[PDB]
From a paper:
The ice-nucleation protein InaZ from Pseudomonas syringae contains a large number of degenerate repeats that span more than a quarter of its sequence and include the segment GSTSTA. The ice-nucleation protein InaZ is produced by P. syringae and localized to its outer membrane. We chose to further investigate a segment whose sequence, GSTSTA, appears identically five times within InaZ at residues 707–712, 755–760, 803–808, 851–856 and 899–904. The benefits of racemic protein crystals for structure determination by MicroED were evaluated and it was confirmed that the phase restriction introduced by crystal centrosymmetry increases the number of successful trials during the ab initio phasing of the electron diffraction data. Both homochiral and racemic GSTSTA form amyloid-like protofibrils with labile, corrugated antiparallel β-sheets that mate face to back.
We optimized crystals of l-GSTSTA for microfocal X-ray diffraction, starting from dense needle clusters and ending with single needles. X-ray diffraction from a single crystal of l-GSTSTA yielded a 91.7% complete data set to approximately 1.1 Å resolution, while data sets from three crystals of l-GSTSTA obtained by MicroED were merged to achieve a data set with an overall completeness of 86.4% at 0.9 Å resolution. Atomic structure solutions were determined for l-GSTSTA from both microfocal X-ray and MicroED data by direct methods (Sheldrick, 2008). During refinement, the number of atoms in the X-ray structure increased to 36 peptide atoms and one bound water. The modeled water molecule also appears to be well ordered, particularly in the structure of l-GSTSTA determined by MicroED, where it has a B factor of 3.28 Å2. The single coordinated water is hydrogen-bonded to Ser708, the C-terminus of a symmetry-related strand and the backbone of Thr709 in the mating sheet. Homochiral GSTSTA forms a class 8 zipper in which two in-register, antiparallel β-sheets meet, related by a 180° rotation normal to the protofibril growth axis. Side chains between neighboring sheets tightly interdigitate to create a close packing within the fibril; the inter-sheet distances range from 5 to 7 Å. The l-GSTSTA protofibril appears tightly restrained within the crystal structure, as shown by a mean B factor of 0.92 Å2.
Residue numbers in the entry: 707 to 712
Amino acid sequence: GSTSTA
């Protein structure tokens, strides 16, 4: 799983 924001 992965989650990234900007």
